[PDB]
Amino acid sequence: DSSRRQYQEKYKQVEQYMSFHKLPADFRQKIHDYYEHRYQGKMFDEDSILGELNGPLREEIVNFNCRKLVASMPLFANADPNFVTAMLTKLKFEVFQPGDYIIREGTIGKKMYFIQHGVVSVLTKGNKEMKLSDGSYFGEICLLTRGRRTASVRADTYCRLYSLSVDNFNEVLEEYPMMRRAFETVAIDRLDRD
Amino acid sequence: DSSRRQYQEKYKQVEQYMSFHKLPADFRQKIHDYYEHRYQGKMFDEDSILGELNGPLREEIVNFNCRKLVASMPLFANADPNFVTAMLTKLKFEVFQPGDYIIREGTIGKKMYFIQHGVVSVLTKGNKEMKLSDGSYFGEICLLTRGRRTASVRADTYCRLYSLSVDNFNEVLEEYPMMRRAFETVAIDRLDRD
Amino acid sequence: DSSRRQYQEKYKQVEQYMSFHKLPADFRQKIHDYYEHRYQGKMFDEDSILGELNGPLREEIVNFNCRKLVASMPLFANADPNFVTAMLTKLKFEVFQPGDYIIREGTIGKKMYFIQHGVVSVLTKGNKEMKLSDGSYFGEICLLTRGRRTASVRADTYCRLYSLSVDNFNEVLEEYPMMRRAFETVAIDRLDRD
Amino acid sequence: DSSRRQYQEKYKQVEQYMSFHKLPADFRQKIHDYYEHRYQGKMFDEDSILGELNGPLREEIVNFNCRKLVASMPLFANADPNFVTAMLTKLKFEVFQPGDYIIREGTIGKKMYFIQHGVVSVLTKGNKEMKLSDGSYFGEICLLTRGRRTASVRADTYCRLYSLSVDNFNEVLEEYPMMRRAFETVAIDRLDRD
Numbered sequence: 191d192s193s194r195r196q197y198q199e200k201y202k203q204v205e206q207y208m209s210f211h212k213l214p215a216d217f218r219q220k221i222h223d224y225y226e227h228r229y230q231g232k233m234f235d236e237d238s239i240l241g242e243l244n245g246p247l248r249e250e251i252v253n254f255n256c257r258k259l260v261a262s263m264p265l266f267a268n269a270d271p272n273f274v275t276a277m278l279t280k281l282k283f284e285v286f287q288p289g290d291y292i293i294r295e296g297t298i299g300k301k302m303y304f305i306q307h308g309v310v311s312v313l314t315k316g317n318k319e320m321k322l323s324d325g326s327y328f329g330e331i332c333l334l335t336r337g338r339r340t341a342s343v344r345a346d347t348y349c350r351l352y353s354l355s356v357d358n359f360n361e362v363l364e365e366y367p368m369m370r371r372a373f374e375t376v377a378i379d380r381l382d383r384d
Numbered sequence: 385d386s387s388r389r390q391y392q393e394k395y396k397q398v399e400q401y402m403s404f405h406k407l408p409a410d411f412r413q414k415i416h417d418y419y420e421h422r423y424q425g426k427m428f429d430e431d432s433i434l435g436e437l438n439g440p441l442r443e444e445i446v447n448f449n450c451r452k453l454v455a456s457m458p459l460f461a462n463a464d465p466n467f468v469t470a471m472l473t474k475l476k477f478e479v480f481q482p483g484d485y486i487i488r489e490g491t492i493g494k495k496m497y498f499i500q501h502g503v504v505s506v507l508t509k510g511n512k513e514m515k516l517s518d519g520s521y522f523g524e525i526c527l528l529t530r531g532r533r534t535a536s537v538r539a540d541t542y543c544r545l546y547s548l549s550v551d552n553f554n555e556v557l558e559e560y561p562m563m564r565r566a567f568e569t570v571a572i573d574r575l576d577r578d
Numbered sequence: 579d580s581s582r583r584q585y586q587e588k589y590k591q592v593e594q595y596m597s598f599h600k601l602p603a604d605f606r607q608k609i610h611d612y613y614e615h616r617y618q619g620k621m622f623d624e625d626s627i628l629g630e631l632n633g634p635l636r637e638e639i640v641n642f643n644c645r646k647l648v649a650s651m652p653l654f655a656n657a658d659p660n661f662v663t664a665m666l667t668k669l670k671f672e673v674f675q676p677g678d679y680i681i682r683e684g685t686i687g688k689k690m691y692f693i694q695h696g697v698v699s700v701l702t703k704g705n706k707e708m709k710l711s712d713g714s715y716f717g718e719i720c721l722l723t724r725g726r727r728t729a730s731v732r733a734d735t736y737c738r739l740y741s742l743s744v745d746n747f748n749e750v751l752e753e754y755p756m757m758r759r760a761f762e763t764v765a766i767d768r769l770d771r772d
Numbered sequence: 773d774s775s776r777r778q779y780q781e782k783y784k785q786v787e788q789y790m791s792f793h794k795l796p797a798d799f800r801q802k803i804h805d806y807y808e809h810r811y812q813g814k815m816f817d818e819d820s821i822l823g824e825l826n827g828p829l830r831e832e833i834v835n836f837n838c839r840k841l842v843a844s845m846p847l848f849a850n851a852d853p854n855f856v857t858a859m860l861t862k863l864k865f866e867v868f869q870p871g872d873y874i875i876r877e878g879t880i881g882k883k884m885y886f887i888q889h890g891v892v893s894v895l896t897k898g899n900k901e902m903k904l905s906d907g908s909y910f911g912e913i914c915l916l917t918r919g920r921r922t923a924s925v926r927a928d929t930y931c932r933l934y935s936l937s938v939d940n941f942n943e944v945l946e947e948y949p950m951m952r953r954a955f956e957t958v959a960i961d962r963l964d965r966d
């Protein structure tokens with residue numbers, strides 16, 4: 191287990207970084223849990239690994255790892271496989287902890303998020319707290335309008351998300367333009383209930 | 385043999401990556417063979433190596449390694465040596481396995497491929513399966529039209545190819561503009577038989 | 579202490595670099611002290627560390643490390659927290675030694691500096707030497723005019739600064755445009771006393 | 773001597789790279805000598821080293837290392853020190869071996885070269901072989917015209933040069949526009965003797 195060694199080795203550097211910058215014990219413990227939920231005691235230079243492979247193998251891997259998320263939402267489940275692949279390839283896996291501000295209402299949004307696992311709270315103003323969990327996405331509004339976030343989104347529980355930047359978003363829709371409607375339909379239904 | 389060590393060391397990380405992401409035994413074995421045909425039990429940071437050298441040495445190396453491919457097709461064999469060099473420098477060696485989708489008809493193409501060794505099948509629609517092997521290239525159509533792939537291309541056997549992106553393609557033709565005809569002649573003969 | 583090892587290990591390479599390039603004993607000793615005041619016997623790949631984290635954790639860290647600087651000047655102390663964060667994220671910590679030319683009058687300026695700790699001398703021409711220390715910034719003039727430096731700025735004592743490039747400067751003001759006045763007010767008061 | 777170890781360690785990888793690609797014994801020996809004249813048995817990650825420093829220290833280092841070249845040619849010797857520094861910072865040290873084609877007449881030139889040590893031959897067509905050695909530069913013609921190389925330039929002896937790309941060239945002249953005349957005067961005298 192050299193990957194395991196990579197984790198333990200890397201985390202010790204994180205413990206020293208925190209010590210050097212004299213971070214509180216509360217924060218250090220948070221950092222700790224983050225690494226644990228995010229990496230799970232095993233680290234690999236995924237960029238280097240996948241870079242050693244080819245397109246097919248890479249697409250095959252991403253499709254397999256995201257298999258859960260795929261069948262989870264209609265968008266990818268009934269869509270063109272080549273669309274699904276192109277989209278997944280651009281996704282960035284991120285892990286958020288309870289209470290984190292995934293989206294802060296009022297700021298220029300540049301990313302949307304797909305929920306693989308977890309629950310988020312949506313504060314539009316006073317009281318919404320609408321909840322979103324496994325199988326749904328959020329943040330598509332500003333990717334479509336290029337304006338300010340119309341709401342706040344925080345992690346309720348531990349959230350295993352996949353982010354997509356506005357640029358990679360438009361890059362994919364450059365090839366599958368009709369798929370942009372799926373995101374619009376959702377952004378409209380949403381802006382409507384407000 | 386430290387390079388050999390680099391390979392074995394790197395592959396073990398790949399074995400752990402796959403285990404962590406619980407990939408099937410069929411896939412793991414495919415990955416395995418890929419690394420074997422692609423690297424052949426020896427890894428070097430080629431980017432770092434060549435970066436330590438200078439232009440002449442680098443060009444000399446690429447010309448020597450691609451020597452086979454060069455004499456293999458008319459394009460490079462009778463062309464201006466400086467054209468041949470400029471072109472080779474931009475090439476990316478890739479290895480495809482039996483059944484892989486090198487090109488998927490209908491997608492916006494951004495790369496063309498030169499076959500050093502192997503055989504590919506060309507599906508234009510129903511039944512073509514035209515075959516291409518050592519000494520020929522494919523994918524130049526979209527590099528010239530900037531449109532969709534007019535056919536599918538899959539690896540029949542194990543394929544040792546060299547890819548060229550549309551940007552590096554136009555960059556070279558910026559200096560040897562007349563050489564663009566060679567690719568056109570082929571793209572026309574081809575679009576003609578359709 | 580592997581970080582400590584990283585420092586000692588890295589500094590020995592610096593000692594050999596200097597030896598190879600036969601640098602004077604005076605300079606070598608300066609380099610030495612630089613590493614000591616800048617790193618303090620402990621090195622971490624901060625880019626790699628923070629890259630392993632997420633946005634929230636990263637912002638939390640930068641806010642904590644810069645906490646001193648924040649309460650130190652009005653600009654960040656009474657400003658919008660999201661503005662403060664966005665700004666800090668773009669800051670680059672730098673350490674200058676006694677007598678260094680932080681800004682050389684007459685050159686096209688592209689960076690401004692916030693003083694966390696230290697004292698600087700401002701030569702406008704003959705004799706000014708106006709002094710600036712903890713809690714104030716300089717260099718905003720050219721970030722606003724895109725012209726030449728209107729004065730020279732040198733480190734009196736050892737200076738622990740934070741730099742901000744003109745691009746990252748305008749990027750933040752793209753989201754908090756009204757905050758640009760704070761820098762203008764200061765650039766005007768200053769150009770006025772000249 | 774860990775730097776020495778870095779060299780020997782790195783060169784062994786180069787020996788294995790060459791073996792893997794079955795390069796001739798003549799070439800391997802050339803590569804060998806290159807590493808020897810270029811690095812001299814000691815390797816350091818200069819990019820990483822200098823990146824750990826600050827602007828002043830970096831400029832001080834480059835000025836010291838290039839001190840020879842500076843006093844060697846009028847251009848830097850009588851010029852504005854800030855011009856000299858800006859220029860040096862953009863220079864790339866390169867080492868050419870006897871018989872190498874530094875510049876190949878007829879190609880779109882993007883770099884000029886300053887000779888620290890060595891002698892080059894200039895073939896304009898039949899017979900020139902004009903020689904240039906320590907203290908002079910070449911290649912400025914295309915940086916000024918953005919056209920084709922008007923001559924060939926080869927290393928006679930072992931050449932220790934410093935290159936400057938057209939972009940970094942125009943970037944510096946953006947700040948010291950009048951200094952562009954120095955290069956013009958030389959490009960004119962030269963085009964004149966043709």
Ligand SMILES: Nc1nc2c(ncn2[C@@H]2O[C@@H]3COP(=O)(O)O[C@H]3[C@H]2O)c(=O)[nH]1
Pocket residue numbers: 293299312314320327328329330331332333338339340341342343380381383384
């Ligand atoms: N305004 C609004 N946003 C919603 C709602 N449900 C989910 N969201 C998401 O909350 C997000 C906040 O940031 P964006 O406006 O960019 O994208 C928004 C939506 O995708 C809703 O009912 N109203």
Ligand SMILES: Nc1nc2c(ncn2[C@@H]2O[C@@H]3COP(=O)(O)O[C@H]3[C@H]2O)c(=O)[nH]1
Pocket residue numbers: 487493506508514521522523524525526527532533534535536537574575577578
């Ligand atoms: N359409 C077509 N493509 C061919 C044929 N033979 C080879 N090809 C290659 O198949 C490729 C599919 O992708 P491109 O159209 O980009 O480039 C095409 C050609 O280079 C042929 O007979 N017809």
Ligand SMILES: Nc1nc2c(ncn2[C@@H]2O[C@@H]3COP(=O)(O)O[C@H]3[C@H]2O)c(=O)[nH]1
Pocket residue numbers: 681687700702708715716717718719720721726727728729730731768769771772
């Ligand atoms: N001209 C001028 N500059 C000042 C003064 N006080 C501080 N400075 C700073 O000195 C800096 C020199 O570079 P800039 O002109 O870019 O930015 C200038 C200011 O921010 C002052 O009184 N006059």
Ligand SMILES: Nc1nc2c(ncn2[C@@H]2O[C@@H]3COP(=O)(O)O[C@H]3[C@H]2O)c(=O)[nH]1
Pocket residue numbers: 875881894896902909910911912913914915920921922923924925962963965966
């Ligand atoms: N044409 C020409 N080039 C010269 C001569 N002496 C030196 N050179 C250099 O040879 C170089 C060849 O490439 P460039 O024309 O770009 O730049 C040219 C000059 O800087 C000369 O006498 N005639």
